[PDB]
Amino acid sequence: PNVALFKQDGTQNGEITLNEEIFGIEPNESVVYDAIIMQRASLRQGTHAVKNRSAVRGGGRKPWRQKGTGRARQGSIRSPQWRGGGVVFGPTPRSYSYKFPKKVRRLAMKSVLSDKVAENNLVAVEGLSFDAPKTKEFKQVLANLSIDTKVLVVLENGNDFAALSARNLPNVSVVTSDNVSVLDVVSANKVLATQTALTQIEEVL
Amino acid sequence: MKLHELKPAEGSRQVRNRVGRGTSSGNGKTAGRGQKGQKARSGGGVRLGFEGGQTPLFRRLPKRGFTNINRKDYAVVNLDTLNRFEDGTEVTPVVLKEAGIVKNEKAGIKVLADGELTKKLTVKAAKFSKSAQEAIEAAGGSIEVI
Amino acid sequence: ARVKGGTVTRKRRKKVLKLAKGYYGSKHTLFKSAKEQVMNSYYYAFRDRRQKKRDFRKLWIARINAAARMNGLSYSKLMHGLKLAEIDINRKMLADLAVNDAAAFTALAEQAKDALSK
Amino acid sequence: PKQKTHRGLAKRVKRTGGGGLKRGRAFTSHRFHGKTKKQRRQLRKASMVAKGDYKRIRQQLARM
RNA sequence: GUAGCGGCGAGCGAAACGGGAAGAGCCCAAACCAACAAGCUUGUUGGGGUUGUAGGACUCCGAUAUGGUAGUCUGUUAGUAUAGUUGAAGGAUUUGGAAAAUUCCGCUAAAGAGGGUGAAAGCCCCGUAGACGAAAUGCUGACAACACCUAGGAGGAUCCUGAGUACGGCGGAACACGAGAAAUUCCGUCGGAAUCCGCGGGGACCAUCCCGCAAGGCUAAAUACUCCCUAGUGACCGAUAGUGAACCAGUACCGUGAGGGAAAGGUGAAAAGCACCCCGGAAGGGGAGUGAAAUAGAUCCUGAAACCGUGUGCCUACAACAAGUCAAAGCUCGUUAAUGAGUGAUGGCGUGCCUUUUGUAGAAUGAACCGGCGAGUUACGAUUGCAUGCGAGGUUAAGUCGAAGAGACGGAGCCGCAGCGAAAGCGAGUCUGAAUAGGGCGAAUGAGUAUGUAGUCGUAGACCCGAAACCAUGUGAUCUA
RNA sequence: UAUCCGGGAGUCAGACUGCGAGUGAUAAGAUCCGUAGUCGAAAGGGAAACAGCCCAGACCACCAGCUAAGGUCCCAAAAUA
RNA sequence: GGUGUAGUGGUAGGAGAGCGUUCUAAGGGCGUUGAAGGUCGAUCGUGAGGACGGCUGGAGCGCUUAGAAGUGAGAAUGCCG
RNA sequence: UGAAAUUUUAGUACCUGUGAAGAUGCAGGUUACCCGCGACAGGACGGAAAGACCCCAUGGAGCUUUACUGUAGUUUGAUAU
Numbered sequence A: 001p002n003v004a005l006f007k008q009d010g011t012q013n014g015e016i017t018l019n020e021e022i023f024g025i026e027p028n029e030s031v032v033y034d035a036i037i038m039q040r041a042s043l044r045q046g047t048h049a050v051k052n053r054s055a056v057r058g059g060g061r062k063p064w065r066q067k068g069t070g071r072a073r074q075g076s077i078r079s080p081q082w083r084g085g086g087v088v089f090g091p092t093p094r095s096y097s098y099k100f101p102k103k104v105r106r107l108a109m110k111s112v113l114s115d116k117v118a119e120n121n122l123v124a125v126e127g128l129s130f131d132a133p134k135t136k137e138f139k140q141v142l143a144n145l146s147i148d149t150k151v152l153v154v155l156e157n158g159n160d161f162a163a164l165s166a167r168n169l170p171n172v173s174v175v176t177s178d179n180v181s182v183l184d185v186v187s188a189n190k191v192l193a194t195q196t197a198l199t200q201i202e203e204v205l
Numbered sequence B: 001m002k003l004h005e006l007k008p009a010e011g012s013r014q015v016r017n018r019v020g021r022g023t024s025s026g027n028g029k030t031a032g033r034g035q036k037g038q039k040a041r042s043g044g045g046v047r048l049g050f051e052g053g054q055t056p057l058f059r060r061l062p063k064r065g066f067t068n069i070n071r072k073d074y075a076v077v078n079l080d081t082l083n084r085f086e087d088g089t090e091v092t093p094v095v096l097k098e099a100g101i102v103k104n105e106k107a108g109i110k111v112l113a114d115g116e117l118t119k120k121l122t123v124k125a126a127k128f129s130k131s132a133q134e135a136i137e138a139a140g141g142s143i144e145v146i
Numbered sequence C: 001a002r003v004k005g006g007t008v009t010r011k012r013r014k015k016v017l018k019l020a021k022g023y024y025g026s027k028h029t030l031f032k033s034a035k036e037q038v039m040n041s042y043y044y045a046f047r048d049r050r051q052k053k054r055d056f057r058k059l060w061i062a063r064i065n066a067a068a069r070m071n072g073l074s075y076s077k078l079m080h081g082l083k084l085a086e087i088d089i090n091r092k093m094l095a096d097l098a099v100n101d102a103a104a105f106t107a108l109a110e111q112a113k114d115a116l117s118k
Numbered sequence D: 001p002k003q004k005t006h007r008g009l010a011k012r013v014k015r016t017g018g019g020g021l022k023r024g025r026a027f028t029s030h031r032f033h034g035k036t037k038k039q040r041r042q043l044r045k046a047s048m049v050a051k052g053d054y055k056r057i058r059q060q061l062a063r064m
Numbered sequence E: 001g002u003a004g005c006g007g008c009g010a011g012c013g014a015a016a017c018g019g020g021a022a023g024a025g026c027c028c029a030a031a032c033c034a035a036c037a038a039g040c041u042u043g044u045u046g047g048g049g050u051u052g053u054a055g056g057a058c059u060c061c062g063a064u065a066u067g068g069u070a071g072u073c074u075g076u077u078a079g080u081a082u083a084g085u086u087g088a089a090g091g092a093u094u095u096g097g098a099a100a101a102u103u104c105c106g107c108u109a110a111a112g113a114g115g116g117u118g119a120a121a122g123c124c125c126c127g128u129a130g131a132c133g134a135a136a137u138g139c140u141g142a143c144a145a146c147a148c149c150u151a152g153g154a155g156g157a158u159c160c161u162g163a164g165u166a167c168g169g170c171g172g173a174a175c176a177c178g179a180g181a182a183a184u185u186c187c188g189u190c191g192g193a194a195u196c197c198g199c200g201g202g203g204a205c206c207a208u209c210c211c212g213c214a215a216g217g218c219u220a221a222a223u224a225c226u227c228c229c230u231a232g233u234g235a236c237c238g239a240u241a242g243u244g245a246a247c248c249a250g251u252a253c254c255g256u257g258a259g260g261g262a263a264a265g266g267u268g269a270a271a272a273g274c275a276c277c278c279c280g281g282a283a284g285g286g287g288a289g290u291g292a293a294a295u296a297g298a299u300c301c302u303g304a305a306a307c308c309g310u311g312u313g314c315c316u317a318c319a320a321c322a323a324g325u326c327a328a329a330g331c332u333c334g335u336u337a338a339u340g341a342g343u344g345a346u347g348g349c350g351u352g353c354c355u356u357u358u359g360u361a362g363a364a365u366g367a368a369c370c371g372g373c374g375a376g377u378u379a380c381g382a383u384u385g386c387a388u389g390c391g392a393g394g395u396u397a398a399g400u401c402g403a404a405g406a407g408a409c410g411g412a413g414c415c416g417c418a419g420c421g422a423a424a425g426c427g428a429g430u431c432u433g434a435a436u437a438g439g440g441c442g443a444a445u446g447a448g449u450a451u452g453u454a455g456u457c458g459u460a461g462a463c464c465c466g467a468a469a470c471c472a473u474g475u476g477a478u479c480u481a
Numbered sequence F: 001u002a003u004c005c006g007g008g009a010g011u012c013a014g015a016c017u018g019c020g021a022g023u024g025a026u027a028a029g030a031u032c033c034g035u036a037g038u039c040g041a042a043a044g045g046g047a048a049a050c051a052g053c054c055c056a057g058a059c060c061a062c063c064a065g066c067u068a069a070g071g072u073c074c075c076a077a078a079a080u081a
Numbered sequence G: 001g002g003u004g005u006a007g008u009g010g011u012a013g014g015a016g017a018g019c020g021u022u023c024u025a026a027g028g029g030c031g032u033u034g035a036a037g038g039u040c041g042a043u044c045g046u047g048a049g050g051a052c053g054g055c056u057g058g059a060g061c062g063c064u065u066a067g068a069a070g071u072g073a074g075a076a077u078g079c080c081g
Numbered sequence H: 001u002g003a004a005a006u007u008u009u010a011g012u013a014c015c016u017g018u019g020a021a022g023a024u025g026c027a028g029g030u031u032a033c034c035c036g037c038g039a040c041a042g043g044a045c046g047g048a049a050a051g052a053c054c055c056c057a058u059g060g061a062g063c064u065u066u067a068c069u070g071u072a073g074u075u076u077g078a079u080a081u
């Protein structure tokens, strides 16, 4: 579609046009949900273990003879019912990550971007240039654009000073156009993207 | 979608059923295993196909046949697929692979006459059925054995 | 992700014990004995909510019989006579009249006897 | 691990187009003097695994 | 989980091709020449040579270069490891013992990671981003130095090219392959070759063809693991958990010995850890003090239940009681204000819970009580349902880049789209059959595939506990023979 | 309601009563079948108590009514009909 | 949402829908003007269960949506106290 | 000064009967004021020991032999030395 283009000073320039194949599709809610769940799961580290009756220290001999003592028959002091005994089943190290069909992945990314554009939470700026990194100046830039909610700042590769000035703000998350994810876009309430970043995004998708 | 309003598609996910968690759940106590017996034990049950000692079906039945070491299987293609090409096109195993019609050619392409051909084509393949060759020739095309 | 016992077990057992309050000794002090007695109490309560209706109808019948005898009639004759006379006053109201409004019960008995004679 | 195939069944049965299993016939080894020529002729023909037997053994031929 | 192996049972189970990570090739023995010594050959040293489109010697020629190294406590240099330095920005207001909390105005951010501070701090402290730093010793990389390898063409007449070896018999073993038709490889025993017109292999064996050249040696990287050290991470545990061990734990304790093997964390912000007085021999209390709090007083945060005790609103000494429930006078009390609460004379009905059973109140089983802990889970596959994407197509695996992420590339490979037959083979048909007959299985009559999720199954301990036992190392004749 | 196709089972110790047989002794709360019911897995009413007999199938509230088997002198509701 | 009809005992067992526990993410909150926890109460829902108030307590914890499970005990002559 | 076995909760009678067929607890009847102390051992199929007898398990172990299959040793021959 067409999105208003703003200059860093905050004054709006002439609109720009975005590819409809990417920013103009009907978002697929279920596909977006699947992508979010898969990404969150992949973030998991999954390092967690317990000691079963074999792994627990000691516990070899039979505590007492099978019959005669009048006590319940036992085989080891480390059986699961014993205090300090092994754990039955329980967590074991494993990976929670899985992969979707490439077409599902692509559709999810396009859906989230198109949702932002449709809701008008996508703000395209002609360029974010800082001679030196200053978080105050980037905060002033956000104020000029009238952004005060969570914002994802998408920058073309090489805009290191913009990234440095923007990253430390609590409401801001900085990502490069080459490295953007469904989770990042969905988490951000607004998406501030430079014109070069939008071009690179369209090329990537 | 918003992370605080996620909603799976209806019927996409179900709740795991946990057994041995009270009687009212319907799987308390015996956990749906019944009362005693081999199948009610941990690790219980007999091996697949076991029949309690009666001679199993495979034991009853005789072995048959052999596998040819020089067996050749041909990737099969029909006139219906051939219709996907234009008149005068040169159909080749490479062409089929690029089009994605035959991803795995196996011993080679054999052409069968299941469909009805309509385009004039010069078809090259390992083998041709008699009906397929006649149909290709009748469609004004030609056939060659690679 | 480990889920220790927590407080749910205590909450459940305390509910049972509060239901068991007033029971004799261990039956209100100890959870296991309390639960068993509370289950039996539930069984008895459900059974008694049906027996209670039987018992009160029985009591009304007895009182109506006494009043009918004093009026010179049996309970069976009185009920048959009331049915003939088209009277639908039930046994609860009949027993209430017998104890409280003797004159009203006597009028009912007179009508029943008249219907029986006819 | 990968589920293993029952090699005896793999040797004795064949998967048909409709998903069924084609099988040989018993009593086709010897002692043919104890069977009428009709029995031998009709046992020469192949057959299909019965529904109950197939439901018992299918998992052993999943990846035949 | 295919080809195969297998009391052809249970089960066991490849390799090549293809796609990737990493990549590297080299030295002798022999012939031949020279030196040395002995006893023309016969041992040592040196030179020479290292192969299958056969190579080398040897004989001619021409070159005395060109490149390389998997060598060195050889130096120089750069970096890095082992201490560190620097590192922005807040005051008041209300509650409070205490401010970081509330309110008001501000300020910093290449630093809003985290930790501590009298409660929850971007701006109080330690830090963090960033910048900077090594006398000394390691380690790494480069540079140089030294060192070591490095030749082309042509002819074969002859010479050399690994012997008790290859191979064979016998007996075993390893190859997925259990002697089977059995290759290939290894061991023991015995027999025992050829050598370039030669030799080995291509799954018995022979012939042809093709591929290779054993009986000598060395060789980095990709791969496996973590006792340790450093910096971190966690939909990992939070004191019956987590290592057996958060605490002076492999300790106490037990055993002759091998060996077995515990319990046990929390005052308070700060000890300010109760001066002094009183009872008492003390212990322990009561005051008085500290403290916001002492019913936080060291058995110290919280302080449940079993169990014990005190006080009392109601009932109880003519009653036969699975202890309750239904009905109910009397008395007592006033709540989440409800057609209330506690107790209860008296009357009706009424043999616990669980397990296992045809059937249990059962005189069958289990529980002394309370509290805590304690049993269908995960991984990889199979299949079905449900859901999503795509659709006669679907889909990537390993691997590279990337934050331990997503994602991108990666089409090798897998499933489906054609079946039939043991097979050759044919093909919307095919097999049987003499048959264009019949019949079987298929097409007409089309949906699959990737992923998620759930049900069930398979391999795994596979829902948890329980044997008598078996096997392999060890410790025991201080008792006893 | 039946088929058929597929996912998931449990069940393979039954008991008694009536009826038809066997074994037994025309015994057994015996044993083995056929048949129907109940219990099993069914509370409620009657048979004093009494899983299998008779009546009858509890989703709940009622201090309402009519009945089944069985009953009406007292325990104990209803006829000293 | 309304009317009508019918149905609603239940072991093995199958199907469906829910309660509660710990943790993760997001959003929105609550807390020395007192969180969790403990205790008492005559409270609400059809059930698992949920609130509210008093007292104790002294620092963390709900709520909505979705996700993951060492997710629910009364019995094992269970283990420890 | 100070335990233990046992212990589902118990306000824990007799007779006859009933019942998983041998009842303190169920039915009918009878008896019995409440709490103890010293004695006895009829019952609680009393406690103690998941019966050793009996049967079962395609359990274990020790032993035997003209069970099967092996095997150490002993012996005989070929062959190498």
Ligand SMILES: [K+]
Residues within 6 Å of the ligand: B032, B033, F009
């Ligand atoms: K089941």
Ligand SMILES: [K+]
Residues within 6 Å of the ligand: B061, B062, B063, B064, D011, D012, D013, D023, D024, D025
């Ligand atoms: K067969």
Ligand SMILES: [K+]
Residues within 6 Å of the ligand: D026, D027, D028, D029, D030, D031
């Ligand atoms: K036969």
Ligand SMILES: [K+]
Residues within 6 Å of the ligand: D002, E001
């Ligand atoms: K496989």
Ligand SMILES: [K+]
Residues within 6 Å of the ligand: E009, E010
């Ligand atoms: K077998």
Ligand SMILES: [K+]
Residues within 6 Å of the ligand: none
């Ligand atoms: K050389």
Ligand SMILES: [K+]
Residues within 6 Å of the ligand: E117, E124
């Ligand atoms: K401070």
Ligand SMILES: [K+]
Residues within 6 Å of the ligand: E121
């Ligand atoms: K801080």
Ligand SMILES: [K+]
Residues within 6 Å of the ligand: none
């Ligand atoms: K250095």
Ligand SMILES: [K+]
Residues within 6 Å of the ligand: E182
């Ligand atoms: K072999």
Ligand SMILES: [K+]
Residues within 6 Å of the ligand: E201, E211, E212
């Ligand atoms: K070769």
Ligand SMILES: [K+]
Residues within 6 Å of the ligand: E296
């Ligand atoms: K305190």
Ligand SMILES: [K+]
Residues within 6 Å of the ligand: none
């Ligand atoms: K009291």
Ligand SMILES: [K+]
Residues within 6 Å of the ligand: none
């Ligand atoms: K009573």
Ligand SMILES: [K+]
Residues within 6 Å of the ligand: E364
């Ligand atoms: K017994």
Ligand SMILES: [K+]
Residues within 6 Å of the ligand: none
């Ligand atoms: K035919």
